[PDB]
Design a protein around this ligand. Structure first.
Ligand SMILES: Nc1ncnc2c1ncn2[C@@H]1O[C@H](COP(=O)(O)OP(=O)(O)OP(=O)(O)O)[C@@H](O)[C@H]1O
Ligand SMILES: Nc1ncnc2c1ncn2[C@@H]1O[C@H](COP(=O)(O)OP(=O)(O)OP(=O)(O)O)[C@@H](O)[C@H]1O
Ligand SMILES: Nc1ncnc2c1ncn2[C@@H]1O[C@H](COP(=O)(O)OP(=O)(O)OP(=O)(O)O)[C@@H](O)[C@H]1O
Ligand SMILES: Nc1ncnc2c1ncn2[C@@H]1O[C@H](COP(=O)(O)OP(=O)(O)OP(=O)(O)O)[C@@H](O)[C@H]1O
Ligand SMILES: Nc1ncnc2c1ncn2[C@@H]1O[C@H](COP(=O)(O)OP(=O)(O)OP(=O)(O)O)[C@@H](O)[C@H]1O
Ligand SMILES: Nc1ncnc2c1ncn2[C@@H]1O[C@H](COP(=O)(O)OP(=O)(O)OP(=O)(O)O)[C@@H](O)[C@H]1O
Ligand SMILES: Nc1ncnc2c1ncn2[C@@H]1O[C@H](COP(=O)(O)OP(=O)(O)OP(=O)(O)O)[C@@H](O)[C@H]1O
Ligand SMILES: [Mg+2]
Ligand SMILES: [Mg+2]
Ligand SMILES: [Mg+2]
Lengths: 252, 255, 253, 250, 243, 237, 253
């Protein structure tokens, strides 16, 4: 009798089921027109400049997603990155505005340009698991106005869970703590971030990426439990797009 | 007082006989595969209809082509095609002379019996929910073709009542198993020199570029986790020159 | 025997070594006051950034940085503020903002351990520093009326030894990648990252405390900073973790 | 369709969020006080260490650390002393040290931007908290009394769920490397490294500032620190580089 | 009414029990020769044959090519007193095909040794069961394997989902272990893996003792190679001259 | 202005660079003996091969951490009928369990090289190699007259060249999966373990810097496992 | 025609010349004896206990090389690693002499035992090259022989050398700074150290290793010009030399 080991027996697709899988899982409707426009305002640093442009955009019917003032290491000069939605006619109007303001130099449009979008996020994440996160969340809500009465029936359920620290040994909760810490660390690493702080029950992460990616990280790291988050607005700096000599000289 | 006890493992040791008995037993088999596959490299002038003309010729003569990929060099009106064939030297050489005679081609080189760098690209979406879920997910799409219901209930109920199926696991343990599987796959693709380009709630996408014999081994190791979606290229190559030391090349004993 | 010149590295004397350490001393930072940090917990409503910034502008508050950060909580934001002044002035500034309807509370991070950080993106030329000295003058000539002294100095610059107009194509190429390498290793020592590489420039990315950011830009300055963009300042509080043996501070009683 | 249970993790609201953030605010600053760092440049004469340490001991000075270290210069030594007290007392200490004739001068790196470094080497168990809790009790009853006391402690620590004696050797083997990986991640993150790996323990080294080096030992404390060896603090002044657009306020 | 979090309750040493543990936990030299030999036909059997005829207790003998035409260097490791090793050195040096044999014992050298090992990714129970099979005496051993295949964490007593997770857990443990040492993982299979390590003989032997519980299926240790390094010390240490 | 390849000139360069068959139809035969560690087993395995005229390239006795058991990875050339003959000769020896044939198996070949490489440039190495050559003549002044020779450079240079060379050697060593284990004032020692042909490539690339000492040893072998997917495993018949 | 190349082939060794170099470069066995001894004192923290032990070693003429007080994470317990050279007879006398002290528990002898030796060094290294370093050195060497400025002729030949920054364009001294910096960085990376500070002129390296590697490293960075240096005494923490199941089976009687 040779040393026995159970065959896992991994099932394999056929051409039919494989197609139906790709067909079904592929985002066929995709999304509605999401396209956002970005602007780069070059303003002069005067005692009252931020309130002007930010207030001017508010004076009109403009929806502003983000607006950040960036110092450019030049005396009395600031670069402002504005993110807004709408259509080309409305955006150009907003771009034609602000530029007319005298403390500004120019308002460039990077919407149809190849740029580098970068936000900065810093978040403290719990290492005590999901059960503790529900416990902590319900606690800061049941203090006042969590309905029309108490929530002790809900609290008792969360603390009745299997993987709640109150039901686990000190050695087991320690390993799950470092297991979670590593899981967060590996997510942060793949996204190209850092772990700048490690405490007894939490850790602080730091990540710089485009809004598309920097929010995808927050979704993947959400189940661990975000205790405190801070996400900056979008910074923009146009890169220099390069194409090979063969693909270049496309004079036609 | 006694010292804190420890259950001694005492890992058993080999002896001279059982060790040799193990090595001999674990021996594979020589020449389990026939003659090594042949790799051809076409230098084709980039004019409209070349892909249909070349590939159409091989199909019109019944040549067992394993893979054919056209690569765009950084030269105007010049493309490179890498073809993989099977068969005797006499049949494959004829295939070379048949393609090279075509008008829009410059020359068809034979890369077999030559030191080359074979490369291939694969991108695969891998499930993080585990083995049990993959059995459920795959069998679910099979019922869209099998047109069976009452008979398949014996299978799906058997699967969903397994221990490590997500339905039977708490939400906190499924989360850990997702990242445990993720860390396993990530460590697995890193050893192969690959990347993890996408991470989701339920799956991840790995990217790897290596020789076919390397990728197939990779896709076999990742297979138990459950490959939801795969894209594997043909095969391209670039000739290598085997360097030898001045002492080794000085051995010109051609007497 | 095959000869090689002894470089003969001289050693310090006990007095000469002490003399240098003292001469290179000090660079003291006995500042009149630190940089006070405030953190406003703010409800999201139309024209709320104009309110906080406007209130600080209406009064004689010398603020340095004001950046609004978004939490993953619906209708909730953070405003990390950095300003100058004394304890009495800024505490009054804290109560000024806190009385505003949209805000919930304004915390003070001045006397607390926080993680100061700001993002910075810079475009740096890979060509010589003399090329940057030429490019600098060219855009200034496009500002100040008339060339005049421009043609007198541009001749002095363009005749320097390591100007890309006085070197073969292979030399400048090897100089661009050498400059590129020197920059990449600078942004590697710092927690940075090179995100773009052009034919005559490159873009670096760095996120750290304003101390390192200011230090980093000072180091890449000689190469020639074409563009720059520094964030305000973000902050997250951290609690100083002390050992169990260091609970003797509790035994101090 | 496959089941797959949901992970409806609760979301913060405006009220509960600001309530938690406010709750996590300190006093702040009740204890202790600011530390002073001094740097002595002394002649390497026989008995200098006895002079300086003896001087600070004879006086009413509470020194935290004192580190002698060579400087690759003949008969020249450098010492880094960490003080405790008001600025007046510290300066009084500095002058009394400098007044000694084997020392050239004594610098004050307190208000200066310096690089603080301290070395640590600790052997950390891999058998978990239960075994470490057992290990301490065995060595404590070997110095306290020869009687068979604390019977309901050794019996309580043992027969615990994750004590090695209650696990198969397979799990203990994995737990060793599981703990090892956790510790290794701490060291790699803190900028340290593992220099030794035994069957039931490992030795890690770490060179960082005193504040950072203490936070590390607190994180690796629950794993069980068998031996430890924290160096004293070394200090070297750096050259701070503010940007070129600072100009002047007045 | 705040979320319950059980304290670790981690105990701490006192001054007495600490030093008590330190006291309790407180506890021949090899000779290395390097022969410079002209690569004559059948010279390995000439040197090794000499060491056997004279009755020496040599540990290793690895022949290395110096990348020079008709020149090889042999690193020989042997134990014994300083007197008997000099005899072994002189005995070899007298051989015609050898140039000179150097004594690398009293010198700071870089001792190296290559090891390739195949380690099972399955549990230690499977390894304990696998050895019994190849050792198989099938009469009384039928009861022994019963005590083995009964144990949990044996692949036969676990779902394939967990076994798969155990394979990679052990794999990551071996990988993290071989990464601390100057090693690497070369081959990964669905049952085992192959590691490669090169360091001083003490490190290899230490590494194999650590990877031992996982169950080493197949191993291969090279002889000890040696290459002398020159110890560098500072100028103030170089100036420390005594008459 | 950087020039570009022509559609025709590109093809010409490819076929011109494409190497002629620089290898025999025969291949690298690898035999792995499983021997009993008896006194004098090494001398008789070698003796049997040497007395019958077999072109062996290496031997390498390897311990297997099993009591009184060793294994030898023998590499030789010749026809299949000759190698099989050489195999049967060794296996017939009574302290030999079996001699496995790896000449047609997926194996992992490993040589281990340690070499001290000079950092003082090609000029100094050319001088040093000529100095030690004179044993058992106007070139010594011709070499020491060349540019970039240490004696013809300032003290600030050479130091800057030594580390430049050090960086080059390190980058070569890193790419091949090796490491620099020692850094002398005028040289450095590298350590590399890989395929014998990969070692030969490394010792050729690092050759111009000057190889002071070298130790290549021999090749070790351990069988790999050809894993293929479930759709390539179902490619039977 | 054909594309030319400057050289044909690199020269090779022969069996006679190869063994000639190996025998010649093989180190002379001078330091066969003369080993150092490592002691570890488990001491109770009494007021002025350091000056008590160090005073004992000095008063009895013991040749100690380093004495470092390490703090354990235990109340009132500190260990001291004493490194001293001498013969076995004298060292044991030193050990027994120290151990006889009241505040010490016991003194262990880590000599002939597998321990982890570790020193910590922080050094400031110039990036301006060799010429500038012997200029800066001679500058603070003016403490002696300042009569009639006799150092002028010694200074003159220094500042008139090719790669002295005063004779180089500022564009080249920049690349020379970073080239030197990368030579130091790739050097300290090899030893397991790290560069923690980079400035306009110099940089600070940090390396923790056994005293042998520390000294070897300082000998390699010495030519670049070490401005400041600080290396602590070694710390000692014994390890456990493991050996395989067939290695430990050397139970021969
Ligand atoms: N679910 C995700 N959403 C967004 N980003 C992800 C996700 N998963 C991983 N990433 C990050 O995306 C990175 C891969 O992007 P990559 O480096 O290849 O740039 P890219 O090819 O230009 O992609 P894109 O064209 O979308 O910008 C991963 O290394 C990882 O850091
Ligand atoms: N089961 C496997 N089959 C094939 N390749 C594997 C397998 N497991 C791992 N690999 C990959 O092979 C790599 C090792 O290949 P290696 O670096 O030795 O190339 P090599 O020296 O040229 O040898 P070979 O000629 O066999 O490819 C591993 O790092 C890993 O990335
Ligand atoms: N000239 C410089 N000025 C400021 N920071 C620098 C300079 N050069 C390098 N750095 C950065 O300082 C970092 C070292 O700081 P470290 O990681 O040791 O934190 P630290 O021990 O708390 O010291 P600090 O108080 O200065 O922050 C380097 O990794 C490097 O990125
Ligand atoms: N000149 C360049 N052109 C294109 N890509 C570059 C260039 N220089 C660097 N890169 C690559 O871009 C990478 C950084 O972009 P990354 O993909 O990581 O973020 P991203 O925001 O997703 O980029 P993008 O939005 O342009 O797709 C670099 O790591 C580098 O590999
Ligand atoms: N709980 C902790 N306490 C102290 N340091 C930690 C802690 N957790 C992590 N670290 C370390 O802090 C480091 C991050 O600090 P960093 O290198 O950025 O210096 P910094 O920007 O000057 O901040 P700081 O002033 O706190 O030193 C991480 O490398 C991390 O290893
Ligand atoms: N139990 C062990 N036995 C031997 N070597 C180990 C062990 N554990 C780890 N190692 C390896 O030893 C390495 C540390 O070696 P190190 O750099 O300190 O050399 P060293 O300073 O000369 O000290 P030593 O004399 O002990 O070799 C670890 O990085 C690790 O790779
Ligand atoms: N000239 C040198 N002197 C001392 N150490 C050096 C020198 N050059 C490099 N090193 C460092 O020594 C390291 C090699 O140490 P290694 O890992 O081989 O430990 P080891 O096997 O115990 O060697 P040893 O017995 O000599 O201590 C190099 O990686 C490098 O970091
Ligand atoms: Mg810091
Ligand atoms: Mg070592
Ligand atoms: Mg390969």
């Amino acid at each position: 009798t040779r040393p026995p080991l159970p065959t896992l027996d991994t099932p394999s697709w056929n051409a039919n089921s494989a197609v139906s899988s790709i067909i079904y899982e592929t985002p066929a409707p995709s999304r509605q027109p999401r396209k956002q426009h970005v602007l780069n305002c070059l303003v002069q640093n005067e005692p009252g400049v931020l309130s002007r442009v930010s207030g001017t955009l508010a004076a009109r019917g403009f929806n502003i997603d983000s607006l950040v003032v960036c110092n450019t290491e030049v005396k009395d000069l600031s670069r402002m990155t504005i993110v807004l939605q709408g259509q080309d006619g409305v955006i150009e109007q907003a771009r034609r505005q602000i530029e007319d303001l005298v403390p500004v130099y120019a308002v460039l449009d990077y919407t149809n340009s190849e740029i580098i979008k970068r936000e900065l996020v810093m978040a403290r994440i719990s290492l005590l698991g999901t059960e503790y996160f529900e416990d902590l969340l319900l606690h800061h809500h049941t203090s006042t106005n969590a309905g029309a009465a108490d929530s002790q029936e809900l609290v008792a359920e969360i603390r009745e869970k299997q993987f709640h620290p109150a039901n686990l040994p000190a050695s087991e909760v320690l390993r799950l703590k470092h297991e979670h810490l590593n899981d967060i660390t590996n997510l942060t690493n793949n996204f190209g971030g850092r772990v700048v702080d490690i405490s007894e029950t939490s850790c602080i992460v730091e990540l710089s990426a485009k809004p598309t990616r920097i929010s995808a990280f927050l979704k993947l790291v959400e189940p661990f439990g975000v205790l405190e988050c801070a996400r900056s607005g979008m910074m923009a700096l146009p890169r220099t797009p390069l194409k090979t000599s063969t693909e270049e000289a496309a004079d036609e």
